[PDB]
Design a protein around this ligand. Structure first.
Ligand SMILES: [Ca+2]
Ligand SMILES: [Ca+2]
Ligand SMILES: [Ca+2]
Ligand SMILES: [Ca+2]
Length: 279
């Protein structure tokens, strides 16, 4: 399958080369897999989600996304135009209030909620969680991401947009989960991207076009937009039976475009998420 004039990110994850704008993917498109977006919530009613998105949990007064962050990440995972896995089920878990921030205890509860809630969902192809959130190191937050992973969910987490070593952030610094840095359309490390030995993979992070609240669209930049790309790829790869929740991160890193990225610190992996799809 080929989507002409796709967002640069989608085109790049189905490319050996930068500078193309057609997304190539297997038409299965992550059907029968679920990606949990642990975020500000999802505008489920966005025509781009085609009824494939639902809010499953909130820790606030509304489950609505009054922010936009989580609607924009959800979109990069599995929206028809801006998604990697165009046929995946999106579950919205609102751990972040509409100002974009949330207590670590609430975030942990959200990660433990997904680890259980998946047993309440039809995800025969497997379960992915996209964590486009971060803060300071916390073993408790690290251990929550470890538990979600261990439970049989592929956990993808932003490295953080501090342009520092992600060893000092959570859940970015958790060894057992997929830590995602951000690249830009010219194959450069995004100036904001965290780095370090704890990074597993890079994703398109800079100027990521996706869905927004008010049934709208906009471009935004972060490791937070690299993550939904890797989250989605994992959903797509799992639906192809090409990997599992537990080994998805490895698989993605084994099959990644290697040495393609510039401004990658020594001792950080030079690996760009790649669907390795051959039309
Ligand atoms: Ca573009
Ligand atoms: Ca976003
Ligand atoms: Ca987000
Ligand atoms: Ca987002």
């Amino acid at each position: 399958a080929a989507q002409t004039n796709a967002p640069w990110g989608l085109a790049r994850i189905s490319s050996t080369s930068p500078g193309t704008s057609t997304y190539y993917y297997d038409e299965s498109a992550g059907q029968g897999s679920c990606v949990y977006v642990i975020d500000t919530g999802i505008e489920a009613s966005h025509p781009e989600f085609e009824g494939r998105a639902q809010m499953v949990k909130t820790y606030y007064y509304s489950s609505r996304d009054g922010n936009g962050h989580g609607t924009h990440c959800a979109g990069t995972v599995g929206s028809r135009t801006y998604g990697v896995a165009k046929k995946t089920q999106l579950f919205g878990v609102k751990v972040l209030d509409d100002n974009g921030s949330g207590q670590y205890s609430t975030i942990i509860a959200g990660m433990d909620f997904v680890a259980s809630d998946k047993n309440n969902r039809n995800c025969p192809k497997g379960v992915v969680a996209s964590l486009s959130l971060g803060g300071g190191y916390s073993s408790s937050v690290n251990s929550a991401a470890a538990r979600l992973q261990s439970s049989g969910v592929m956990v993808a987490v932003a490295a953080g947009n501090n342009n520092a070593d992600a060893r000092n952030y959570s859940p970015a610094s958790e060894p057992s989960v997929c830590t995602v840095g951000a690249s830009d359309r010219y194959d450069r490390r995004s100036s904001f991207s965290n780095y370090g030995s704890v990074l597993d993979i890079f994703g398109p992070g800079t100027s990521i076009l996706s869905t927004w609240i008010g049934g709208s669209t906009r471009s935004i930049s972060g490791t937070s937009m690299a993550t939904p790309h890797v989250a989605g790829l994992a959903a797509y790869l799992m639906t192809l039976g090409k990997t599992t929740a537990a080994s998805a991160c490895r698989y993605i890193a084994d099959t990644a475009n290697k040495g393609d990225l510039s401004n990658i610190p020594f001792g950080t992996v030079n690996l760009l998420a790649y669907n390795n799809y051959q039309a």
